[PDB]
Design a protein around this ligand. Structure first.
Ligand SMILES: CN(C)C(=O)c1cc2cnc(Nc3ccc(-c4csc5c(=O)cc(N6CCOCC6)oc45)cc3)nc2n1C1CCCC1
Length: 131
């Protein structure tokens, strides 16, 4: 009833490390992880614990910062854009499922606003770093 967590490691997959991806782990996610509103996003949503029957009917691609952190540590992404998409998927799922003004929505918007501030300091070019 609770689907398995999303994939965090996969053999024979396009994988590498870039200066932008390192910045996503060492600076961006590091700042968002220690936010006061971060804990509801540090692990996948437990739909049966929170009594959300129609969650996985609406949300087709669940995503959370715990999964993103593991994917960054395991070098699961091919470039930075693949990781930023996972953040935007996480935010959008909360916007899709919940009414505007709800508590969990306000917390997600605060994280996204901070996320976009830390993203503006990303290096201009994406250069490949050895693993
Ligand atoms: C004032 N209260 C009740 C609190 O301080 C409080 C005590 C809590 C105990 N456990 C949790 N766990 C929790 C863990 C994950 C989520 C979550 C992540 S995405 C997402 C989402 O999209 C929708 C929901 N909902 C379930 C509750 O509200 C209706 C919509 O929850 C989530 C929500 C809650 N939150 C707790 N909270 C807050 C309320 C919800 C988030 C934090």
């Amino acid at each position: 009833t609770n689907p398995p967590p999303p994939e965090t490691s996969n053999p024979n997959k396009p994988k590498r490390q870039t200066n932008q991806l390192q910045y996503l782990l060492r600076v961006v996610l590091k700042t968002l992880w220690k936010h006061q509103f971060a804990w509801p996003f540090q692990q996948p949503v437990d739909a049966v614990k929170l009594n959300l029957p129609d969650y996985y009917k609406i949300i087709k691609t669940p995503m959370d910062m715990g999964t993103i952190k593991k994917r960054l540590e395991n070098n699961y992404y091919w470039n930075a854009q693949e990781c930023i998409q996972d953040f935007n998927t996480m935010f959008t799922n909360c916007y899709i499922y919940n009414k505007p003004g709800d508590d969990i929505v306000l917390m997600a918007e605060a994280l996204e606003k901070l996320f976009l501030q830390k993203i503006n300091e990303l290096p201009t070019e994406e250069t490949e770093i050895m693993i």
